[PDB]
Protein backbone atom coordinates (compact mmCIF):
# COMPACT_ATOMS: atom_id res chain seq x y z
CA UNK A 1 0.00 0.00 0.00
CA UNK A 2 1.11 3.55 0.80
CA UNK A 3 2.55 5.11 3.93
CA UNK A 4 0.23 7.29 5.98
CA UNK A 5 1.27 10.93 5.70
CA UNK A 6 -1.40 12.69 7.80
CA UNK A 7 -0.96 15.71 5.50
CA UNK A 8 -4.57 16.87 5.81
CA UNK A 9 -5.84 19.80 7.90
CA UNK A 10 -7.49 19.01 11.20
CA UNK A 11 -11.19 18.32 10.87
CA UNK A 12 -13.80 20.83 11.98
CA UNK A 13 -14.85 19.82 15.50
CA UNK A 14 -18.00 21.16 17.14
CA UNK A 15 -18.18 18.22 19.56
CA UNK A 16 -18.03 14.45 19.74
CA UNK A 17 -20.65 11.93 18.61
CA UNK A 18 -20.92 8.35 19.91
CA UNK A 19 -19.00 5.92 17.75
CA UNK A 20 -18.61 2.52 19.41
CA UNK A 21 -19.17 0.55 22.61
CA UNK A 22 -18.28 -3.06 23.39
CA UNK A 23 -20.38 -3.81 26.52
CA UNK A 24 -17.58 -6.14 27.62
CA UNK A 25 -18.57 -6.48 31.28
CA UNK A 26 -22.27 -6.92 30.49
CA UNK A 27 -21.43 -9.73 28.07
CA UNK A 28 -19.00 -11.22 30.60
CA UNK A 29 -21.89 -12.15 32.90
CA UNK A 30 -23.05 -14.80 30.42
CA UNK A 31 -20.17 -15.21 27.99
CA UNK A 32 -16.44 -15.91 27.85
CA UNK A 33 -14.93 -12.42 27.64
CA UNK A 34 -11.32 -11.51 28.39
CA UNK A 35 -10.39 -9.60 31.51
CA UNK A 36 -8.83 -6.41 30.16
CA UNK A 37 -7.33 -3.14 31.34
CA UNK A 38 -5.82 -0.04 29.76
CA UNK A 39 -7.49 -0.27 26.32
CA UNK A 40 -6.88 1.93 23.31
CA UNK A 41 -8.10 2.31 19.74
CA UNK A 42 -6.05 2.56 16.56
CA UNK A 43 -7.30 2.56 12.98
CA UNK A 44 -6.14 1.08 9.69
CA UNK A 45 -6.73 3.11 6.53
CA UNK A 46 -9.87 0.92 6.30
CA UNK A 47 -11.18 0.16 9.81
CA UNK A 48 -10.43 0.74 13.49
CA UNK A 49 -9.30 -1.85 16.03
CA UNK A 50 -9.59 -2.26 19.76
CA UNK A 51 -6.51 -2.97 21.84
CA UNK A 52 -6.26 -4.02 25.47
CA UNK A 53 -3.84 -5.63 27.90
CA UNK A 54 -5.67 -8.82 28.72
CA UNK A 55 -4.90 -10.37 32.09
CA UNK A 56 -4.39 -13.84 30.62
CA UNK A 57 -7.86 -14.97 31.70
CA UNK A 58 -11.58 -14.54 31.15
CA UNK A 59 -14.02 -13.04 33.64
CA UNK A 60 -15.94 -16.27 34.37
CA UNK A 61 -12.67 -17.87 35.42
CA UNK A 62 -10.88 -18.68 38.65
CA UNK A 63 -7.81 -16.78 37.43
CA UNK A 64 -9.76 -13.51 37.13
CA UNK A 65 -9.41 -13.28 40.91
CA UNK A 66 -6.85 -10.59 41.83
CA UNK A 67 -6.58 -9.06 38.35
CA UNK A 68 -5.78 -5.55 39.62
CA UNK A 69 -2.01 -6.02 39.27
CA UNK A 70 -0.61 -3.91 36.45
CA UNK A 71 2.28 -6.18 35.43
CA UNK A 72 2.07 -9.98 35.25
CA UNK A 73 3.81 -12.43 32.89
CA UNK A 74 0.40 -13.50 31.55
CA UNK A 75 -0.61 -10.06 30.25
CA UNK A 76 -0.97 -9.95 26.47
CA UNK A 77 -2.02 -7.33 23.93
CA UNK A 78 -5.45 -8.27 22.58
CA UNK A 79 -6.64 -7.09 19.18
CA UNK A 80 -9.86 -7.17 17.20
CA UNK A 81 -11.88 -4.79 15.06
CA UNK A 82 -13.71 -2.04 16.90
CA UNK A 83 -17.05 -3.23 18.24
CA UNK A 84 -16.18 -6.93 18.44
CA UNK A 85 -15.92 -7.81 22.16
CA UNK A 86 -12.77 -9.49 23.44
CA UNK A 87 -14.04 -13.06 23.16
CA UNK A 88 -12.00 -16.27 23.13
CA UNK A 89 -11.27 -15.81 19.42
CA UNK A 90 -9.32 -12.60 20.05
CA UNK A 91 -5.77 -12.50 18.72
CA UNK A 92 -3.07 -11.92 21.34
CA UNK A 93 -0.48 -10.17 19.19
CA UNK A 94 2.28 -10.01 21.81
CA UNK A 95 3.18 -10.45 25.46
CA UNK A 96 2.89 -7.04 27.11
CA UNK A 97 1.86 -5.34 30.31
CA UNK A 98 2.50 -2.07 28.45
CA UNK A 99 1.81 -1.53 24.79
CA UNK A 100 1.42 0.85 21.86
CA UNK A 101 0.23 0.14 18.33
CA UNK A 102 0.19 2.16 15.12
CA UNK A 103 -0.55 1.34 11.49
CA UNK A 104 1.83 3.07 9.08
CA UNK A 105 -0.55 2.51 6.17
CA UNK A 106 1.26 -0.70 5.21
CA UNK A 107 1.56 -2.90 8.31
CA UNK A 108 0.85 -2.93 12.02
CA UNK A 109 3.58 -1.98 14.47
CA UNK A 110 3.18 -3.09 18.09
CA UNK A 111 5.52 -1.90 20.83
CA UNK A 112 5.16 -4.46 23.62
CA UNK A 113 6.86 -4.22 27.02
CA UNK A 114 7.03 -7.33 29.19
CA UNK A 115 9.39 -9.07 31.59
CA UNK A 116 10.53 -8.11 35.04
CA UNK A 117 9.71 -4.68 36.43
CA UNK A 118 13.38 -3.74 36.79
CA UNK A 119 14.62 -5.52 33.62
CA UNK A 120 11.74 -5.10 31.19
CA UNK A 121 12.03 -5.91 27.49
CA UNK A 122 10.31 -3.76 24.86
CA UNK A 123 9.69 -5.79 21.70
CA UNK A 124 8.92 -3.99 18.43
CA UNK A 125 6.70 -6.21 16.27
CA UNK A 126 6.14 -4.94 12.72
CA UNK A 127 4.12 -6.75 10.03
CA UNK A 128 3.50 -9.67 12.37
CA UNK A 129 7.18 -10.37 13.08
CA UNK A 130 9.62 -9.20 15.74
CA UNK A 131 12.02 -6.66 14.24
CA UNK A 132 13.74 -4.92 17.16
CA UNK A 133 13.88 -4.89 20.95
CA UNK A 134 15.32 -2.77 23.75
CA UNK A 135 15.95 -3.27 27.44
CA UNK A 136 15.20 -1.05 30.40
CA UNK A 137 17.73 1.79 30.28
CA UNK A 138 16.83 2.97 33.80
CA UNK A 139 16.25 -0.48 35.37
CA UNK A 140 12.78 0.60 36.48
CA UNK A 141 9.31 -0.08 35.06
CA UNK A 142 9.82 0.56 31.35
CA UNK A 143 6.49 1.69 29.92
CA UNK A 144 5.04 3.24 26.79
CA UNK A 145 2.09 5.35 25.64
CA UNK A 146 -0.55 2.69 26.39
CA UNK A 147 -2.30 4.16 23.35
CA UNK A 148 -1.87 4.46 19.61
CA UNK A 149 1.45 5.68 18.27
CA UNK A 150 1.68 7.84 15.16
CA UNK A 151 3.48 6.94 11.93
CA UNK A 152 4.19 9.82 9.55
CA UNK A 153 5.60 8.79 6.15
CA UNK A 154 6.56 5.38 7.54
CA UNK A 155 8.38 6.67 10.64
CA UNK A 156 6.49 5.71 13.81
CA UNK A 157 7.30 7.64 16.98
CA UNK A 158 6.71 5.97 20.35
CA UNK A 159 7.21 7.70 23.70
CA UNK A 160 8.91 5.36 26.17
CA UNK A 161 9.30 6.19 29.85
CA UNK A 162 11.66 4.49 32.29
CA UNK A 163 12.14 5.47 35.91
CA UNK A 164 10.20 6.41 39.00
CA UNK A 165 6.47 7.01 38.69
CA UNK A 166 6.73 9.68 41.42
CA UNK A 167 10.06 11.28 40.57
CA UNK A 168 12.39 12.13 37.73
CA UNK A 169 12.05 9.48 35.02
CA UNK A 170 13.96 9.13 31.76
CA UNK A 171 11.60 9.55 28.81
CA UNK A 172 12.87 8.79 25.31
CA UNK A 173 11.07 9.25 22.00
CA UNK A 174 11.86 6.33 19.70
CA UNK A 175 11.57 6.72 15.93
CA UNK A 176 10.76 3.41 14.27
CA UNK A 177 10.91 2.63 10.54
CA UNK A 178 9.45 -0.78 9.63
CA UNK A 179 10.05 -2.00 13.17
CA UNK A 180 13.68 -0.85 13.29
CA UNK A 181 14.66 1.82 15.82
CA UNK A 182 16.30 4.43 13.58
CA UNK A 183 16.55 7.18 16.21
CA UNK A 184 16.12 7.67 19.95
CA UNK A 185 15.65 11.26 21.10
CA UNK A 186 15.60 12.05 24.83
CA UNK A 187 12.68 14.14 26.01
CA UNK A 188 13.55 17.85 25.98
CA UNK A 189 11.62 20.93 27.01
CA UNK A 190 9.85 22.10 30.16
CA UNK A 191 7.88 18.91 30.89
CA UNK A 192 9.34 17.31 34.01
CA UNK A 193 7.39 14.03 34.01
CA UNK A 194 5.97 12.45 30.85
CA UNK A 195 4.02 9.18 30.94
CA UNK A 196 1.14 7.53 29.06
CA UNK A 197 1.03 10.00 26.18
CA UNK A 198 -2.02 10.43 23.98
CA UNK A 199 -0.25 11.15 20.69
CA UNK A 200 -1.98 12.44 17.58
CA UNK A 201 -0.54 13.46 14.20
CA UNK A 202 0.04 17.20 13.71
CA UNK A 203 1.94 17.14 10.44
CA UNK A 204 4.90 17.36 10.05
CA UNK A 205 5.04 16.74 13.80
CA UNK A 206 3.41 14.54 16.41
CA UNK A 207 1.70 16.10 19.42
CA UNK A 208 1.49 14.04 22.62
CA UNK A 209 -0.58 15.24 25.57
CA UNK A 210 0.88 13.10 28.33
CA UNK A 211 0.20 12.48 32.03
CA UNK A 212 2.28 14.09 34.78
CA UNK A 213 2.49 11.59 37.63
CA UNK A 214 4.86 13.64 39.80
CA UNK A 215 3.78 17.25 40.39
CA UNK A 216 1.39 18.48 37.72
CA UNK A 217 -2.35 18.15 37.46
CA UNK A 218 -1.95 19.88 34.08
CA UNK A 219 -1.10 17.51 31.26
CA UNK A 220 2.35 17.96 29.69
CA UNK A 221 2.55 18.44 25.93
CA UNK A 222 5.30 16.75 23.92
CA UNK A 223 5.79 18.03 20.38
CA UNK A 224 7.77 15.62 18.20
CA UNK A 225 9.03 16.46 14.71
CA UNK A 226 9.36 13.23 12.72
CA UNK A 227 11.73 14.80 10.17
CA UNK A 228 14.63 16.15 12.27
CA UNK A 229 13.74 14.04 15.35
CA UNK A 230 13.51 17.17 17.52
CA UNK A 231 11.49 17.23 20.75
CA UNK A 232 10.01 20.19 22.59
CA UNK A 233 7.72 19.99 25.58
CA UNK A 234 5.44 22.27 27.57
CA UNK A 235 2.18 22.05 29.53
CA UNK A 236 -1.43 22.58 28.50
CA UNK A 237 -2.25 26.25 28.97
CA UNK A 238 -5.86 25.87 30.10
CA UNK A 239 -6.62 26.50 33.75
CA UNK A 240 -9.13 23.65 33.56
CA UNK A 241 -6.66 20.84 34.18
CA UNK A 242 -7.51 17.44 32.75
CA UNK A 243 -5.66 15.14 35.15
CA UNK A 244 -7.22 13.56 38.22
CA UNK A 245 -6.60 14.03 41.11
CA UNK A 246 -6.87 17.82 40.82
CA UNK A 247 -8.22 20.88 42.57
CA UNK A 248 -11.67 22.19 41.75
CA UNK A 249 -12.27 24.43 38.74
CA UNK A 250 -11.97 27.67 40.71
CA UNK A 251 -8.58 26.87 42.27
CA UNK A 252 -6.93 24.88 39.46
CA UNK A 253 -4.23 26.55 37.39
CA UNK A 254 -1.73 26.05 34.58
CA UNK A 255 0.89 28.38 33.08
CA UNK A 256 2.16 26.37 30.07
CA UNK A 257 5.73 25.85 31.35
CA UNK A 258 5.72 24.30 34.85
CA UNK A 259 3.59 21.72 36.66
CA UNK A 260 1.05 23.49 38.83
CA UNK A 261 1.94 21.42 41.93
CA UNK A 262 -1.77 20.96 42.73
CA UNK A 263 -2.67 17.36 43.60
CA UNK A 264 -0.15 16.12 41.05
CA UNK A 265 1.09 13.14 43.04
CA UNK A 266 -0.97 10.80 40.86
CA UNK A 267 -2.67 10.99 37.50
CA UNK A 268 -4.82 9.34 34.88
CA UNK A 269 -4.14 8.83 31.21
CA UNK A 270 -5.95 11.51 29.25
CA UNK A 271 -6.03 13.47 26.00
CA UNK A 272 -6.16 17.00 24.65
CA UNK A 273 -5.84 18.49 21.20
CA UNK A 274 -5.74 22.01 19.81
CA UNK A 275 -8.55 23.35 17.61
CA UNK A 276 -6.52 26.30 16.41
CA UNK A 277 -5.93 28.25 19.62
CA UNK A 278 -8.62 26.45 21.65
CA UNK A 279 -8.11 23.10 23.35
CA UNK A 280 -10.48 20.14 23.22
CA UNK A 281 -9.83 18.17 26.39
CA UNK A 282 -11.54 15.28 28.15
CA UNK A 283 -11.35 14.72 31.89
CA UNK A 284 -13.14 12.84 34.63
CA UNK A 285 -16.06 14.71 36.17
CA UNK A 286 -14.94 13.81 39.69
CA UNK A 287 -11.85 15.73 40.79
CA UNK A 288 -10.52 13.07 43.17
CA UNK A 289 -11.60 9.77 41.58
CA UNK A 290 -12.00 8.39 38.06
CA UNK A 291 -15.77 8.82 38.27
CA UNK A 292 -17.59 10.20 35.25
CA UNK A 293 -16.11 11.80 32.17
CA UNK A 294 -16.65 15.09 30.36
CA UNK A 295 -15.22 16.74 27.26
CA UNK A 296 -15.26 20.45 26.50
CA UNK A 297 -13.51 23.17 24.54
CA UNK A 298 -11.57 25.83 26.44
CA UNK A 299 -11.46 29.07 24.45
CA UNK A 300 -7.82 30.10 23.94
CA UNK A 301 -6.91 27.15 26.14
CA UNK A 302 -3.89 26.09 24.09
CA UNK A 303 -2.26 29.55 23.97
CA UNK A 304 -3.53 31.73 26.82
CA UNK A 305 -2.21 30.49 30.19
CA UNK A 306 -4.73 29.73 32.94
CA UNK A 307 -7.71 29.97 30.57
CA UNK A 308 -10.93 28.74 32.19
CA UNK A 309 -13.51 29.83 29.58
CA UNK A 310 -15.03 26.52 28.52
CA UNK A 311 -17.75 25.78 25.96
CA UNK A 312 -19.35 22.82 24.16
CA UNK A 313 -19.22 20.67 27.29
CA UNK A 314 -20.41 17.08 26.82
CA UNK A 315 -21.03 14.54 29.57
CA UNK A 316 -19.62 11.28 28.22
CA UNK A 317 -20.14 9.26 31.41
CA UNK A 318 -22.39 10.54 34.17
CA UNK A 319 -20.93 11.58 37.51
CA UNK A 320 -22.03 8.47 39.39
CA UNK A 321 -20.40 5.98 37.00
CA UNK A 322 -16.79 4.83 36.93
CA UNK A 323 -14.36 5.84 34.20
CA UNK A 324 -10.66 5.26 33.60
CA UNK A 325 -7.92 5.82 31.05
CA UNK A 326 -8.89 8.06 28.16
CA UNK A 327 -6.96 8.65 24.98
CA UNK A 328 -7.05 10.01 21.46
CA UNK A 329 -6.78 8.55 17.99
CA UNK A 330 -7.02 10.10 14.55
CA UNK A 331 -9.00 9.01 11.49
CA UNK A 332 -7.97 10.20 8.03
CA UNK A 333 -11.12 11.51 6.38
CA UNK A 334 -11.79 12.38 2.77
CA UNK A 335 -10.00 15.73 3.11
CA UNK A 336 -9.54 16.35 6.85
CA UNK A 337 -8.15 14.51 9.88
CA UNK A 338 -10.84 13.68 12.45
CA UNK A 339 -9.98 13.49 16.14
CA UNK A 340 -11.66 10.65 18.02
CA UNK A 341 -11.25 9.59 21.63
CA UNK A 342 -12.09 6.61 23.82
CA UNK A 343 -12.91 6.22 27.51
CA UNK A 344 -12.09 3.13 29.55
CA UNK A 345 -14.86 2.22 32.01
CA UNK A 346 -13.12 0.32 34.81
CA UNK A 347 -15.31 -1.94 36.94
CA UNK A 348 -14.46 -4.13 39.90
CA UNK A 349 -11.54 -3.98 42.31
CA UNK A 350 -10.51 -2.08 44.21
CA UNK A 351 -13.35 0.44 44.22
CA UNK A 352 -16.08 -2.23 43.98
CA UNK A 353 -15.45 -5.01 46.50
CA UNK A 354 -18.45 -7.12 45.44
CA UNK A 355 -16.33 -8.95 42.85
CA UNK A 356 -12.72 -10.16 42.87
CA UNK A 357 -11.75 -9.04 39.35
CA UNK A 358 -10.74 -5.75 37.77
CA UNK A 359 -11.83 -5.32 34.16
CA UNK A 360 -13.19 -2.63 31.86
CA UNK A 361 -15.28 -1.81 28.82
CA UNK A 362 -14.49 0.91 26.30
CA UNK A 363 -16.65 3.61 24.75
CA UNK A 364 -15.45 5.52 21.69
CA UNK A 365 -16.44 9.00 20.51
CA UNK A 366 -15.48 10.62 17.21
CA UNK A 367 -15.30 14.33 16.56
CA UNK A 368 -18.08 15.77 14.43
CA UNK A 369 -18.66 19.06 12.63
CA UNK A 370 -22.44 18.63 12.85
CA UNK A 371 -24.89 18.81 15.71
CA UNK A 372 -25.38 16.34 18.54
CA UNK A 373 -27.56 15.66 21.55
CA UNK A 374 -26.82 14.61 25.11
CA UNK A 375 -26.70 11.32 26.97
CA UNK A 376 -24.47 9.20 29.19
CA UNK A 377 -22.89 5.91 28.11
CA UNK A 378 -21.59 4.08 31.18
CA UNK A 379 -20.59 0.43 31.36
CA UNK A 380 -24.10 -0.47 32.52
CA UNK A 381 -23.11 -3.74 34.20
CA UNK A 382 -24.83 -4.60 37.48
CA UNK A 383 -22.02 -5.78 39.75
CA UNK A 384 -24.44 -7.98 41.72
CA UNK A 385 -25.30 -10.00 38.60
CA UNK A 386 -21.66 -10.53 37.74
CA UNK A 387 -19.61 -13.61 38.69
CA UNK A 388 -17.55 -13.08 41.83
Amino acid at each position, epitope marked *: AEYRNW*S*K*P*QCNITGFAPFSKDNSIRLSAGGDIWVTREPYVSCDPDKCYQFALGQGTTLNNGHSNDTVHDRTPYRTLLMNELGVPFHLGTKQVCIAWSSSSCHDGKAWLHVCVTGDDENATASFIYNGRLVDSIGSWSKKILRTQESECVCINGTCTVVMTDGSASGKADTKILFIEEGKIVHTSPL*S*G*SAQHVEECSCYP*R*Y*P*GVRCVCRDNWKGSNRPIV*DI*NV*K*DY*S*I*VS*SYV*CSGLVGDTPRKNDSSSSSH*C*LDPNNEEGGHGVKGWAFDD*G*NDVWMGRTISEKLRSGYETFKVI*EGW*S*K*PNSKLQINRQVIVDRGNRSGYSGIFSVEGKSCINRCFYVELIRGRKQETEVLWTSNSIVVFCGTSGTYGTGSWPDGADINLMPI
Partner: antibody
Amino acid sequence: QVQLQESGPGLVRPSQTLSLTCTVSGASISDVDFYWTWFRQTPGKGLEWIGYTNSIGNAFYNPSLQSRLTISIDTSDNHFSLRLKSVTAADTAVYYCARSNSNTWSREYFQHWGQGTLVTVSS
Amino acid sequence: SVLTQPPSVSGAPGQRVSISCTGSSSNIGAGFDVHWYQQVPGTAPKLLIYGNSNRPSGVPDRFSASKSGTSASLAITGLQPEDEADYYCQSYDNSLSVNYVFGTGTRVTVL
Protein backbone atom coordinates in the same frame (compact mmCIF):
# COMPACT_ATOMS: atom_id res chain seq x y z
CA GLN B 1 10.55 31.94 -7.52
CA VAL B 2 8.67 32.57 -4.28
CA GLN B 3 7.59 36.19 -3.82
CA LEU B 4 6.12 37.43 -0.54
CA GLN B 5 4.26 40.73 -0.17
CA GLU B 6 3.07 41.97 3.22
CA SER B 7 -0.11 44.04 3.22
CA GLY B 8 -1.84 45.48 6.27
CA PRO B 9 -2.81 48.70 8.03
CA GLY B 10 0.11 50.90 9.00
CA LEU B 11 -1.50 52.31 12.16
CA VAL B 12 -3.39 50.32 14.81
CA ARG B 13 -4.71 51.81 18.03
CA PRO B 14 -3.47 50.36 21.33
CA SER B 15 -5.47 47.37 22.62
CA GLN B 16 -6.87 46.84 19.11
CA THR B 17 -6.20 43.85 16.83
CA LEU B 18 -3.27 44.06 14.43
CA SER B 19 -3.97 42.13 11.23
CA LEU B 20 -1.43 41.65 8.43
CA THR B 21 -1.66 39.59 5.25
CA CYS B 22 1.25 38.23 3.20
CA THR B 23 0.34 37.51 -0.42
CA VAL B 24 2.50 34.85 -2.06
CA SER B 25 3.31 34.93 -5.78
CA GLY B 26 5.29 32.54 -7.95
CA ALA B 27 4.62 29.56 -5.68
CA SER B 28 1.70 27.68 -4.15
CA ILE B 29 1.25 27.83 -0.38
CA SER B 30 -1.04 24.79 -0.51
CA ASP B 31 1.90 22.34 -0.50
CA VAL B 32 2.61 21.28 3.10
CA ASP B 33 6.39 21.14 3.15
CA PHE B 34 7.24 24.72 4.18
CA TYR B 35 6.50 26.86 7.21
CA TRP B 36 5.01 30.26 6.40
CA THR B 37 6.68 32.45 8.99
CA TRP B 38 6.15 35.92 10.43
CA PHE B 39 8.91 38.09 11.89
CA ARG B 40 9.07 41.55 13.39
CA GLN B 41 11.96 43.95 13.99
CA THR B 42 11.46 46.64 16.60
CA PRO B 43 13.62 49.69 15.80
CA GLY B 44 15.66 49.38 18.99
CA LYS B 45 16.19 45.61 18.86
CA GLY B 46 16.93 42.74 16.48
CA LEU B 47 14.64 40.40 14.60
CA GLU B 48 12.04 38.46 16.56
CA TRP B 49 10.37 35.25 15.43
CA ILE B 50 6.59 35.64 15.72
CA GLY B 51 5.03 32.37 14.59
CA TYR B 52 4.78 29.45 12.19
CA THR B 53 2.16 27.82 10.00
CA ASN B 54 1.76 25.55 6.97
CA SER B 55 -1.09 24.92 4.54
CA ILE B 56 -2.53 22.30 6.90
CA GLY B 57 -2.83 24.79 9.77
CA ASN B 58 -0.35 23.35 12.28
CA ALA B 59 1.00 26.61 13.69
CA PHE B 60 3.75 27.32 16.21
CA TYR B 61 3.92 30.65 18.02
CA ASN B 62 6.57 32.57 19.92
CA PRO B 63 6.16 31.62 23.61
CA SER B 64 6.43 35.29 24.59
CA LEU B 65 3.56 36.37 22.33
CA GLN B 66 1.80 32.99 22.15
CA SER B 67 -1.21 34.18 24.16
CA ARG B 68 -2.10 36.76 21.50
CA LEU B 69 -1.32 35.98 17.88
CA THR B 70 -3.20 33.77 15.44
CA ILE B 71 -1.49 32.83 12.18
CA SER B 72 -4.02 31.71 9.58
CA ILE B 73 -3.68 30.15 6.13
CA ASP B 74 -5.78 30.46 2.98
CA THR B 75 -4.87 27.95 0.27
CA SER B 76 -7.58 29.32 -2.04
CA ASP B 77 -6.55 32.99 -2.07
CA ASN B 78 -2.92 31.79 -1.69
CA HIS B 79 -2.03 33.99 1.28
CA PHE B 80 -1.41 33.72 5.01
CA SER B 81 -2.25 36.23 7.72
CA LEU B 82 -1.16 37.34 11.18
CA ARG B 83 -3.56 38.57 13.87
CA LEU B 84 -2.11 40.09 17.04
CA LYS B 85 -4.56 40.88 19.84
CA SER B 86 -4.31 43.73 22.35
CA VAL B 87 -1.38 45.51 20.73
CA THR B 88 0.66 48.00 22.76
CA ALA B 89 3.65 50.31 22.41
CA ALA B 90 5.88 47.21 22.16
CA ASP B 91 4.08 45.99 19.02
CA THR B 92 5.30 48.78 16.73
CA ALA B 93 7.87 47.23 14.41
CA VAL B 94 8.60 46.21 10.83
CA TYR B 95 6.76 42.94 10.23
CA TYR B 96 8.33 40.52 7.75
CA CYS B 97 6.63 37.48 6.24
CA ALA B 98 9.06 34.71 5.35
CA ARG B 99 9.10 31.08 4.22
CA SER B 100 11.19 28.44 5.95
CA ASN B 101 13.50 26.13 4.03
CA SER B 102 11.66 22.93 4.99
CA ASN B 103 9.26 21.47 7.56
CA THR B 104 11.90 20.70 10.20
CA TRP B 105 12.35 22.78 13.36
CA SER B 106 16.01 22.64 14.42
CA ARG B 107 17.33 22.98 10.85
CA GLU B 108 15.24 25.96 9.76
CA TYR B 109 16.57 28.98 7.90
CA PHE B 110 14.41 31.57 6.16
CA GLN B 111 15.71 32.32 2.66
CA HIS B 112 12.64 33.99 1.15
CA TRP B 113 11.41 37.15 2.89
CA GLY B 114 8.86 39.86 2.27
CA GLN B 115 9.52 43.56 1.92
CA GLY B 116 8.51 44.49 5.47
CA THR B 117 5.58 46.64 6.58
CA LEU B 118 5.89 49.29 9.28
CA VAL B 119 3.05 48.77 11.77
CA THR B 120 2.76 51.64 14.26
CA VAL B 121 0.73 51.43 17.47
CA SER B 122 0.00 54.93 18.78
CA SER B 123 -2.75 57.53 19.08
CA SER C 1 15.66 34.94 25.12
CA VAL C 2 18.17 36.07 22.48
CA LEU C 3 21.74 35.26 21.53
CA THR C 4 24.41 37.87 22.21
CA GLN C 5 26.74 39.61 19.76
CA PRO C 6 29.17 42.53 19.95
CA PRO C 7 27.20 45.76 19.39
CA SER C 8 29.54 46.94 16.62
CA VAL C 9 32.51 45.57 14.67
CA SER C 10 34.59 47.87 12.46
CA GLY C 11 37.19 47.13 9.81
CA ALA C 12 39.07 48.79 6.97
CA PRO C 13 38.70 47.50 3.40
CA GLY C 14 40.89 44.50 2.65
CA GLN C 15 41.28 43.15 6.18
CA ARG C 16 38.95 40.73 7.97
CA VAL C 17 36.57 40.92 10.94
CA SER C 18 34.85 38.38 13.16
CA ILE C 19 31.35 38.38 14.66
CA SER C 20 31.04 36.15 17.72
CA CYS C 21 27.62 34.71 18.52
CA THR C 22 27.33 33.14 21.98
CA GLY C 23 24.59 30.60 22.69
CA SER C 24 23.38 28.59 25.66
CA SER C 25 22.34 25.07 26.69
CA SER C 26 19.07 25.18 24.69
CA ASN C 27 20.87 27.01 21.87
CA ILE C 28 24.05 26.91 19.76
CA GLY C 29 25.42 24.78 22.60
CA ALA C 30 22.76 22.12 21.96
CA GLY C 31 24.17 21.30 18.52
CA PHE C 32 21.50 23.20 16.59
CA ASP C 33 22.61 24.79 13.34
CA VAL C 34 23.56 28.48 13.38
CA HIS C 35 22.36 30.66 10.52
CA TRP C 36 23.63 34.15 9.71
CA TYR C 37 21.45 36.89 8.21
CA GLN C 38 22.66 40.12 6.62
CA GLN C 39 20.24 43.06 6.76
CA VAL C 40 21.06 46.45 5.29
CA PRO C 41 19.13 48.87 7.55
CA GLY C 42 15.66 49.69 6.25
CA THR C 43 15.44 46.59 4.04
CA ALA C 44 14.54 42.93 4.49
CA PRO C 45 17.07 40.50 5.98
CA LYS C 46 19.08 38.34 3.60
CA LEU C 47 20.16 34.83 4.54
CA LEU C 48 23.96 34.68 4.42
CA ILE C 49 25.02 31.33 5.94
CA TYR C 50 23.12 28.19 6.90
CA GLY C 51 24.40 24.90 8.29
CA ASN C 52 26.96 27.10 10.11
CA SER C 53 28.70 27.42 6.74
CA ASN C 54 26.69 26.77 3.56
CA ARG C 55 26.56 30.09 1.62
CA PRO C 56 23.43 29.48 -0.49
CA SER C 57 23.86 31.36 -3.78
CA GLY C 58 25.02 34.77 -4.97
CA VAL C 59 26.77 35.21 -1.61
CA PRO C 60 30.44 36.24 -1.90
CA ASP C 61 33.08 33.78 -0.73
CA ARG C 62 34.27 36.45 1.72
CA PHE C 63 31.78 35.29 4.36
CA SER C 64 32.69 32.22 6.41
CA ALA C 65 31.07 30.66 9.46
CA SER C 66 32.21 28.22 12.13
CA LYS C 67 30.45 26.77 15.18
CA SER C 68 32.18 25.47 18.30
CA GLY C 69 30.66 24.55 21.65
CA THR C 70 28.16 27.24 22.65
CA SER C 71 29.65 29.88 20.33
CA ALA C 72 29.58 30.63 16.62
CA SER C 73 31.60 33.05 14.52
CA LEU C 74 31.01 34.79 11.19
CA ALA C 75 34.19 35.76 9.35
CA ILE C 76 34.16 38.39 6.60
CA THR C 77 37.42 38.23 4.62
CA GLY C 78 37.94 41.39 2.59
CA LEU C 79 35.65 43.90 4.32
CA GLN C 80 34.62 45.25 0.92
CA PRO C 81 32.04 48.04 0.62
CA GLU C 82 28.39 46.91 0.44
CA ASP C 83 29.21 44.71 3.47
CA GLU C 84 28.08 47.54 5.77
CA ALA C 85 24.95 46.03 7.31
CA ASP C 86 23.51 44.39 10.42
CA TYR C 87 24.45 40.73 10.82
CA TYR C 88 22.22 38.50 12.95
CA CYS C 89 22.96 34.95 14.07
CA GLN C 90 19.83 32.80 14.18
CA SER C 91 19.52 29.49 16.01
CA TYR C 92 16.84 27.12 17.24
CA ASP C 93 15.80 27.31 20.90
CA ASN C 94 13.93 24.38 22.48
CA SER C 95 13.86 25.41 26.15
CA LEU C 96 10.10 26.07 26.11
CA SER C 97 8.71 25.23 22.66
CA VAL C 98 9.61 25.59 18.98
CA ASN C 99 11.48 28.90 19.10
CA TYR C 100 14.05 30.72 16.99
CA VAL C 101 16.45 33.11 18.73
CA PHE C 102 18.29 35.84 16.85
CA GLY C 103 21.47 37.64 17.79
CA THR C 104 21.44 41.13 19.25
CA GLY C 105 22.66 42.42 15.88
CA THR C 106 26.22 43.33 14.92
CA ARG C 107 26.71 46.51 12.88
CA VAL C 108 29.69 46.11 10.54
CA THR C 109 31.04 49.61 9.84
CA VAL C 110 33.68 49.62 7.10
CA LEU C 111 35.82 52.70 7.75
